[PDB]
C-alpha cells in the first residue's frame, strides 16, 4: 500500500508539473497575442498621430 502511494505520489507530482508548464505556455499564448492586439494600438497610433 505504501509502495503504491509512492508511485501515485509521483503521478501527482508529474501532473502538478504538467499543468505548471502547460498553462505557463498557454497563458503566454494568448497573452502575447493580446500583446499583438496591444501592438495594433501603439503601432498604428504612431502614424495615426
From TrEMBL:
Domain of life (superkingdom): Eukaryota
Instruction: Tell where it localizes.
Output: Cell projection, Cilium; Cytoplasm, Cytoskeleton, Microtubule organizing center, Centrosome
What is the name of the protein in this document? Rab-GAP TBC domain-containing protein
What organism is this sequence from?
Answer: Tetrahymena thermophila (strain SB210)
Amino acid at each position: 500500500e505504501a509502495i503504491l502511494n509512492l508511485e501515485l505520489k509521483t503521478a501527482g507530482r508529474i501532473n502538478e508539473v504538467l499543468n505548471t508548464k502547460t498553462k505557463d505556455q498557454n497563458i503566454q499564448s494568448i497573452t502575447l497575442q493580446a500583446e499583438i492586439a496591444q501592438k495594433r494600438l501603439d503601432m498604428k497610433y504612431k502614424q495615426m498621430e
